[PDB]
Design a protein around this ligand. Structure first.
Ligand SMILES: *[C@@H]1O[C@H](CO)[C@@H](O[C@@H]2O[C@H](CO)[C@@H](O[C@@H]3O[C@H](CO)[C@@H](O)[C@H](O)[C@@H]3O)[C@H](O)[C@H]2NC(C)=O)[C@H](O)[C@H]1NC(C)=O
Ligand SMILES: *[C@@H]1O[C@H](CO)[C@@H](O[C@@H]2O[C@H](CO)[C@@H](O[C@@H]3O[C@H](CO)[C@@H](O)[C@H](O)[C@@H]3O)[C@H](O)[C@H]2NC(C)=O)[C@H](O)[C@H]1NC(C)=O
Ligand SMILES: *[C@@H]1O[C@H](CO)[C@@H](O[C@@H]2O[C@H](CO)[C@@H](O)[C@H](O)[C@H]2NC(C)=O)[C@H](O)[C@H]1NC(C)=O
Ligand SMILES: *[C@@H]1O[C@H](CO)[C@@H](O[C@@H]2O[C@H](CO)[C@@H](O)[C@H](O)[C@H]2NC(C)=O)[C@H](O)[C@H]1NC(C)=O
Ligand SMILES: *[C@@H]1O[C@H](CO)[C@@H](O[C@@H]2O[C@H](CO)[C@@H](O)[C@H](O)[C@H]2NC(C)=O)[C@H](O)[C@H]1NC(C)=O
Ligand SMILES: *[C@@H]1O[C@H](CO)[C@@H](O[C@@H]2O[C@H](CO)[C@@H](O)[C@H](O)[C@H]2NC(C)=O)[C@H](O)[C@H]1NC(C)=O
Ligand SMILES: *[C@@H]1O[C@H](CO)[C@@H](O[C@@H]2O[C@H](CO)[C@@H](O)[C@H](O)[C@H]2NC(C)=O)[C@H](O)[C@H]1NC(C)=O
Ligand SMILES: *[C@@H]1O[C@H](CO)[C@@H](O[C@@H]2O[C@H](CO)[C@@H](O)[C@H](O)[C@H]2NC(C)=O)[C@H](O)[C@H]1NC(C)=O
Ligand SMILES: *[C@@H]1O[C@H](CO)[C@@H](O[C@@H]2O[C@H](CO)[C@@H](O)[C@H](O)[C@H]2NC(C)=O)[C@H](O)[C@H]1NC(C)=O
Ligand SMILES: *[C@@H]1O[C@H](CO)[C@@H](O[C@@H]2O[C@H](CO)[C@@H](O)[C@H](O)[C@H]2NC(C)=O)[C@H](O)[C@H]1NC(C)=O
Ligand SMILES: *[C@@H]1O[C@H](CO)[C@@H](O[C@@H]2O[C@H](CO)[C@@H](O)[C@H](O)[C@H]2NC(C)=O)[C@H](O)[C@H]1NC(C)=O
Ligand SMILES: *[C@@H]1O[C@H](CO)[C@@H](O)[C@H](O)[C@H]1NC(C)=O
Ligand SMILES: *[C@@H]1O[C@H](CO)[C@@H](O)[C@H](O)[C@H]1NC(C)=O
Ligand SMILES: *[C@@H]1O[C@H](CO)[C@@H](O)[C@H](O)[C@H]1NC(C)=O
Ligand SMILES: *[C@@H]1O[C@H](CO)[C@@H](O)[C@H](O)[C@H]1NC(C)=O
Ligand SMILES: *[C@@H]1O[C@H](CO)[C@@H](O)[C@H](O)[C@H]1NC(C)=O
Ligand SMILES: *[C@@H]1O[C@H](CO)[C@@H](O)[C@H](O)[C@H]1NC(C)=O
Ligand SMILES: *[C@@H]1O[C@H](CO)[C@@H](O)[C@H](O)[C@H]1NC(C)=O
Ligand SMILES: *[C@@H]1O[C@H](CO)[C@@H](O)[C@H](O)[C@H]1NC(C)=O
Ligand SMILES: *[C@@H]1O[C@H](CO)[C@@H](O)[C@H](O)[C@H]1NC(C)=O
Ligand SMILES: *[C@@H]1O[C@H](CO)[C@@H](O)[C@H](O)[C@H]1NC(C)=O
Ligand SMILES: *[C@@H]1O[C@H](CO)[C@@H](O)[C@H](O)[C@H]1NC(C)=O
Ligand SMILES: *[C@@H]1O[C@H](CO)[C@@H](O)[C@H](O)[C@H]1NC(C)=O
Ligand SMILES: *[C@@H]1O[C@H](CO)[C@@H](O)[C@H](O)[C@H]1NC(C)=O
Ligand SMILES: *[C@@H]1O[C@H](CO)[C@@H](O)[C@H](O)[C@H]1NC(C)=O
Ligand SMILES: *[C@@H]1O[C@H](CO)[C@@H](O)[C@H](O)[C@H]1NC(C)=O
Ligand SMILES: *[C@@H]1O[C@H](CO)[C@@H](O)[C@H](O)[C@H]1NC(C)=O
Ligand SMILES: *[C@@H]1O[C@H](CO)[C@@H](O)[C@H](O)[C@H]1NC(C)=O
Ligand SMILES: *[C@@H]1O[C@H](CO)[C@@H](O)[C@H](O)[C@H]1NC(C)=O
Lengths: 427, 111, 117, 117, 427, 117
């Protein structure tokens, strides 16, 4: 027999490449390749392939690009350095409920005007979570990082993007119900672009993601190792209704030539606490399903207890919710309060000085939004950690563990079209 | 640098009709003028472009053409209306100018 | 657009026109596209260069002057073309790729050229 | 360097060596040059890939195994090669381009290879 | 018959690509591809092609690139933020003519020295058009935008550039006298690069452009629609002589470590008003030609009246002229003062704070030039708008309508070298 | 990987598979790599285009229809193939490169195609 060379052979190997974005908003960018209105999906009969969501470099690219965009989009904005001044500040008491006592403060200070030789006396209402008592206050992070306000015209809506492989590469999708984080699956198809993934940023409860189709999925590395996070994907949504009931106004204060600070204004109507409403019966059925599935790894008669949270900072102990461009830190307690052998109202706090992906060295100021905010989201899954009885509680961590829940189905491979085989022919 | 003319010589009876034809080596739209030159005289303009007569020109003169094919029809020929007829390209397709740019002819029309 | 979908080498050798075409087919998401386009071109050209040097340019199926060395396999053509997925085959003889390619280059430079001039 | 200058397809088919060569021939005006060079390469390679898959690589004029389907035209070769500008011709049959190209690929993969091996 | 494939066929289609620059100055960049000393132009016999100057994307690229260069070149320069200080300021009266009364003011202020703990008292003479009365004055735009001075070593000379298509593309040129803004022309040639175009920036009167070769050309979209601008291209130049007669001096004032402000100095000799001289007889003949051509669209016995200007800001009502790096705003009245059925002296003003392509949010300060400026330019065309009698007057608008007057002759096309035809042959 | 190491044209003509392969083989040291990759591709393609238009594609050694014009040299083949280093030869006839290349293109377009169709 003789060597015969074949070109265009259907052979692939694991690979890492950068991916293309396909699709004014802070992440949308509006510089992505328009998507294919009629994308193809090609089924591969008799192909079994191995996937591993915990070692998937698509997660790392999503993380790196979203952080880089955050800065590329918010970098060319007004700095708030002039606000790191001693503030004189007292409590807002004029028309408040009991739940809001001490929550808001009326601060006033001496700040630079359009002319550098003149000062103005201005005021703003700040949330308690943004100041430090030295009646004299400092803003949080004036001793740690520079604070830049976000540009008021930039939207923070989690508009979905698609990732696309370069020619010569392809993305394999694992179309397999009941497939956990790792191992082979018998159902694979080839796509050039991923499904659209919304860059939703949250902690504890995953919002507006994909649903499982047959059962609540519990995906984790090891399971028995309690140092790892458990990603629980619901097969049904739980609807959650969040609100910020106070009717706000805002002020534009010049801080020098070409720049202005967005200060909060006065509040219209009475002052009430922000909150989220989770349908109660829906939540109770949803956890019952989570429990039945958890028992498969812990024992059929094992008690599964749900606790509120571990101790920690707001980014750990409260639900992190970003809607309308406002930043909420919700109590998330009472949702996880059972042993398993109307609506739930979750009090929620608001904070304007944000330290997010870059934990230190940089801060962003969320400008106020006038009017009242009402936001409705889908709870699609949980981040849980584990401690006769097993105890579970809401967890958190870097965003990579949340984004990987939308990318567990994908792997990047390279095409190797050139190869040989023995045949009965010759040159 | 464009026109050529082919009939050379034509004879007709009084009251008859003759035609003459010119061709362009390059397409020139409708940019062809026509002239009538009587012996011993400076030429007279008959036609501006392929389809337009000059005022004062008898209605018996008419013509048409486009691209590279152009003709002149002279009907109701008058006795002794003898002349040499000519074509001129009024458009220079190389320089883009629009002026007389190449001339030629010879018809010996005798009646 | 990929094969090896239960397609043994015999059947797989007939779908080469599809897989052969999908090889070519300063913002954060700006510079990355430029870099990605360059990568796609680079891979395309590397494969074309090998086909060129082996005398397989312009062909999907190329018979050559290199005999099959039995040390490269433990199966008959009657076994692999009918029972093995192209993908399985490529993995089984992957460690001989560099041997075969060097032989293919000599089989042209000398046998089809230095000896033909 | 372009033709179709009153040049009918017959004459135009003879000037192909000229038009075939002018296909390849971080400041504001810095990054743009890099992007432009990549674009020029991309277009060149896409045309070469099609010539390759149809078996027309290395040729300016390529006769193939695909018969002309009369549904594609309303003229004789004696009419188009002598009276039509290459440019006019290309516009008149532009809506059949994708049909002809698919047929040309099959005419190689099967007829010149799967049936020849 | 059989399909025969041909490669290198002379076929082109409309296309949009970026173009290459071919050719220290602010626009010249000095990073362009050297031009071809012996460029080719290839005539296309029997080719008629359609052009449209109003939909020509080459105009948009010129506009985008020149704006981007403006900032790339002037961005790394000294900021003048410290000058947004209350100024104490009085009129310059020491040696002036009547025409200049109130035109210049002697301002003084307290400014930062090399050391931040020390101040200096300095003065500068400002043009009236650069200050706002609050004897207390503010600089224009200290309440709107940041002001950055241009770097003193950067030239603003409108050095020409050429645009070149990438391989695989070509530029078609319409070599047709009397060709208006749109439609087919029978005279086309292929070039790889455009003629050099000077990036001249002006309003109302187009300076240093190309001339028409046979007649004054009137190009507009619609004509009958009076909302559109009329671009009038002269077939002869009109020479205009502009001057700034005062002999200026300048001062370098340190504004802190590593930076200095260029202040104006004292004036040598008497103070006179800047002005432009348009040859009178030449101007009168030039308009007579414009009128004869305008009548072709309005009637042979229609009265054509020329008015000075509409109301508006300086960028609208005066001629905008940039020469030597100095910025002039000329009266342009008396040039357009007739019904049509020595020299003209145009008084002219000077302004140093410039808001140009980016109308708001950014300002540039033009440093003073020592000595006396004399500048001679070619008027090559007009921007006119229209209102028994038709009335026309100088117009203005974005620079795109001025730059398109040099690009009306060009179109970008792509080459499609691969195609088929039936033949009597077979494989 | 280079030859011309005392290797006269005869011997040098046999090492072409090596030299033919080493032709393809936003930080300060980031953007520069992207620019360098584009340059390497550009040079590769320019040489391939010339081989294509002359009908030398896929070959290391290509005999053509252009006769040698004696005005191009002052030596016999028996003198240059045995005594001259490839490098010396290339320098000696460098001023005729553009003549030979134009002739090679005509030798294909007309002689092998317009006259064969
Ligand atoms: C989960 O998905 C829902 C549905 O897409 C998201 O709700 C949407 O949130 C945006 C931003 O707050 C709302 O847009 C705003 O609408 C008002 C008018 O009511 C307009 O004045 C604003 O300028 C802005 O366009 C949008 O209406 C709302 N959609 C619906 C159906 O209510 C939700 O934010 C997502 N959850 C998370 C955490 O991102
Ligand atoms: C229209 O075109 C004319 C001719 O090119 C332009 O005039 C030129 O303007 C520059 C800048 O003001 C002059 O350069 C300067 O010359 C002095 C010496 O006299 C030197 O000290 C400066 O450093 C600088 O190099 C140039 O001499 C002058 N050319 C002529 C013939 O007078 C005119 O500016 C253009 N019009 C517009 C609006 O751009
Ligand atoms: C919450 O989940 C529901 C149910 O999956 C979503 O509603 C469906 O949306 C798809 C389009 O994506 C439609 O084709 C279905 O008909 C809808 N079903 C129902 C019952 O309405 C809903 O959009 C999700 N909400 C969010 C914010 O993601
Ligand atoms: C969240 O808001 C939705 C509406 O956006 C609530 O559902 C509606 O309830 C009213 C009765 O009060 C019905 O008439 C509507 O038809 C329902 N709309 C939909 C889309 O279902 C929902 O109950 C709220 N959830 C919570 C926990 O308060
Ligand atoms: C989890 O729930 C327990 C039980 O409610 C919290 O412990 C105390 O709860 C009472 C209200 O019932 C508060 O007044 C006490 O201040 C809480 N104790 C402490 C030390 O804070 C517990 O704090 C909850 N944990 C989290 C993270 O919310
Ligand atoms: C433009 O079209 C004209 C015809 O309309 C072509 O002119 C003829 O060309 C043939 C050669 O192909 C000559 O034999 C004829 O004598 C020419 N006619 C005339 C009146 O001279 C012309 O060649 C075309 N232009 C180009 C470049 O092909
Ligand atoms: C997947 O593998 C099965 C066999 O394990 C293939 O099924 C047979 O295919 C041949 C044709 O090649 C038929 O003649 C047999 O009758 C099929 N067997 C049965 C039970 O139906 C199947 O074709 C493979 N899939 C693909 C796409 O090739
Ligand atoms: C003003 O217009 C005149 C006339 O077109 C320009 O002078 C000509 O310049 C060209 C070179 O571009 C020479 O070849 C001609 O011989 C010159 N003609 C005359 C009469 O001098 C002049 O340069 C233009 N001025 C400006 C500033 O553009
Ligand atoms: C603009 O300046 C030019 C010179 O740069 C003036 O023209 C000159 O006039 C003198 C007579 O005063 C002649 O001797 C020169 O030969 C002329 N030079 C040229 C180049 O023509 C011109 O008159 C001035 N224009 C206006 C309106 O004042
Ligand atoms: C256009 O010309 C008219 C007529 O001269 C200007 O109207 C007045 O002109 C006199 C001088 O003759 C001034 O003293 C008045 O102040 C002008 N009136 C107004 C309201 O300003 C008219 O202003 C001119 N328009 C422009 C834009 O220059
Ligand atoms: C360098 O040049 C020398 C001669 O000047 C070459 O040496 C001879 O090589 C031939 C083979 O081509 C042998 O038959 C002779 O016997 C060698 N001469 C001697 C004195 O030994 C040498 O081969 C050249 N180097 C290379 C790499 O070709
Ligand atoms: C904040 O203080 C200002 C006086 O500086 C007062 O006019 C305003 O009403 C106060 N706002 C609130 C909410 O107390
Ligand atoms: C402000 O809040 C603190 C903390 O609850 C409380 O001690 C203080 O008395 C409050 N001040 C006023 C004016 O209510
Ligand atoms: C502003 O400065 C004066 C300086 O005398 C000081 O008394 C006053 O308390 C300051 N005001 C604020 C709101 O910081
Ligand atoms: C800022 O002050 C807080 C006071 O609670 C302190 O905990 C924090 O460490 C300080 N930041 C830095 C960078 O020292
Ligand atoms: C996923 O399924 C495989 C068997 O297909 C099993 O070996 C693996 O342990 C499962 N993963 C986890 C976290 O249990
Ligand atoms: C939550 O439920 C309460 C009634 O218990 C209702 O007054 C409130 O408006 C609801 N909030 C939201 C966001 O639906
Ligand atoms: C959540 O609310 C409870 C009251 O039920 C409170 O005791 C607890 O401290 C709150 N937890 C967080 C993280 O705010
Ligand atoms: C947990 O349940 C108990 C009743 O068993 C109730 O008193 C307590 O308030 C609940 N905790 C939360 C956070 O709702
Ligand atoms: C929630 O589940 C518990 C058992 O874990 C049950 O006792 C309780 O009644 C359920 N509540 C609702 C609203 O279904
Ligand atoms: C401006 O004022 C200074 C004194 O501060 C004086 O010396 C100078 O002569 C004045 N300049 C003019 C033009 O009046
Ligand atoms: C300065 O100019 C204004 C406006 O013309 C005039 O009223 C004022 O009297 C002038 N001042 C001096 C000192 O001339
Ligand atoms: C400089 O500051 C002093 C402060 O006492 C003030 O009196 C003086 O008028 C200021 N001078 C200028 C030119 O602004
Ligand atoms: C700056 O002051 C002038 C005073 O005439 C005013 O018209 C302009 O709107 C002000 N700028 C801004 C941004 O408010
Ligand atoms: C330009 O000329 C064409 C005829 O060639 C005519 O239809 C069009 O209206 C003219 N353009 C204008 C603005 O009049
Ligand atoms: C304009 O003409 C006047 C004479 O009327 C003359 O004094 C002046 O210098 C001329 N200006 C220019 C720029 O030529
Ligand atoms: C132009 O000058 C005249 C004096 O003839 C004056 O009335 C008019 O306001 C000035 N126009 C502009 C735009 O400066
Ligand atoms: C316009 O012409 C009149 C004479 O008819 C003259 O008085 C007036 O000053 C002229 N206008 C301008 C701006 O020169
Ligand atoms: C300008 O033209 C007008 C007619 O519109 C005429 O009366 C006047 O005398 C002319 N002036 C010159 C200098 O030619």
């Amino acid at each position: 027999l003789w060597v015969t060379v074949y070109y265009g052979v259907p052979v692939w190997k694991d690979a890492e490449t950068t991916l293309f974005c396909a699709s004014h908003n802070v992440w949308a960018t509006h510089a992505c390749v328009p998507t294919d209105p009629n994308p193809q999906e090609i089924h591969l009969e008799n192909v079994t392939e191995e996937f591993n969501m915990w070692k998937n470099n698509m997660v790392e690219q999503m993380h790196t690009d979203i952080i880089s965009l955050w800065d590329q989009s918010l970098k060319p904005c007004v700095k708030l350095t002039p606000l790191c001044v001693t503030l004189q500040c007292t409590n807002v008491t004029n028309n408040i409920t009991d739940d809001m006592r001490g929550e808001l403060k009326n601060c006033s200070f001496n700040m630079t005007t359009e002319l550098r030789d003149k000062k103005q006396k201005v005021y703003s209402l700040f949330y308690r979570l943004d100041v430090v008592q030295i009646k004299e206050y400092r803003l949080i992070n004036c001793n740690t990082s520079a604070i830049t306000q976000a540009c008021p015209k930039v939207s923070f809506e989690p508009i979905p993007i698609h990732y696309c492989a370069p020619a010569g590469f392809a993305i394999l999708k694992c179309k397999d119900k009941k497939f956990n984080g790792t191992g082979p699956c018998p159902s694979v198809s080839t796509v050039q672009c991923t499904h659209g993934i919304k860059p939703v940023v949250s902690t504890q409860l995953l919002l507006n993601g994909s649903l499982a189709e047959e059962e609540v999925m519990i995906r984790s590395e090891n399971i028995t190792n309690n140092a790892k996070n458990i990603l629980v994907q619901f097969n049904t949504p739980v609807q959650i209704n969040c609100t910020r009931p106070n009717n706000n106004t805002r002020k534009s204060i010049r801080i020098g030539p070409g720049q202005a600070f967005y200060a909060t204004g006065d509040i219209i109507g009475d002052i009430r606490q922000a909150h989220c409403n989770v349908s109660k019966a829906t939540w109770n059925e949803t956890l019952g399903k989570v429990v039945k599935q958890l028992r498969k790894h812990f024992g059929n008669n094992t008690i599964i207890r749900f606790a509120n949270s571990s101790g920690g900072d707001l980014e750990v102990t409260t639900h992190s919710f970003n809607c309308g461009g406002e930043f909420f830190y919700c109590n998330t307690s009472g949702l996880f309060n059972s042993t398993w052998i109307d609506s739930i109202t979750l009090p929620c706090r608001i904070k304007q000085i944000i330290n997010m992906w870059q934990r230190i060295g940089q801060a962003m100021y969320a400008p106020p939004i006038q009017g009242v905010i009402r936001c409705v989201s889908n709870i699609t899954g949980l981040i849980l950690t584990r401690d006769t009885t097993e105890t579970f509680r809401p967890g958190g961590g870097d965003m990579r563990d949340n984004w990987r829940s939308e990318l567990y189905k994908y792997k990047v491979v390279k095409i190797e079209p050139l190869g040989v085989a023995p045949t009965r022919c010759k040159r | 640098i464009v026109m050529t003319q082919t009939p050379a010589s034509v004879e007709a009876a009084v009251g008859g009709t003759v035609t003459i034809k010119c061709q362009a080596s390059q397409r020139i739209g409708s940019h062809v003028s026509w002239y009538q030159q009587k012996p011993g005289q400076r030429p007279k303009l008959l036609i501006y472009g392929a389809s337009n007569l000059e005022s004062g020109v008898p209605s018996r003169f008419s013509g048409s053409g486009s691209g590279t094919q152009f003709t002149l029809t002279i009907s109701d020929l008058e006795c002794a209306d003898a002349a040499t007829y000519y074509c001129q390209a009024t458009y220079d397709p190389y320089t883009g100018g629009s002026y007389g740019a190449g001339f030629g002819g010879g018809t010996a029309v005798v009646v | 657009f990929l094969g090896a979908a239960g397609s043994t080498m015999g059947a797989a050798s007939m779908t080469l026109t599809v897989q052969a075409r999908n090889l070519l087919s300063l913002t954060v998401w700006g510079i990355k596209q430029l870099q990605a386009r360059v990568l796609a071109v680079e891979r395309y050209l590397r494969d074309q260069q090998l086909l060129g040097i082996w005398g397989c340019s312009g062909k999907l199926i190329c018979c050559t002057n290199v005999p099959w060395n039995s040390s490269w396999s433990n199966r008959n053509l009657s076994e692999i073309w009918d029972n093995m997925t192209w993908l399985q085959w490529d993995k089984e003889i992957s460690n001989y790729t560099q041997i075969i390619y060097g032989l293919l280059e000599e089989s042209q430079n000398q046998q089809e050229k230095n000896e033909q001039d």
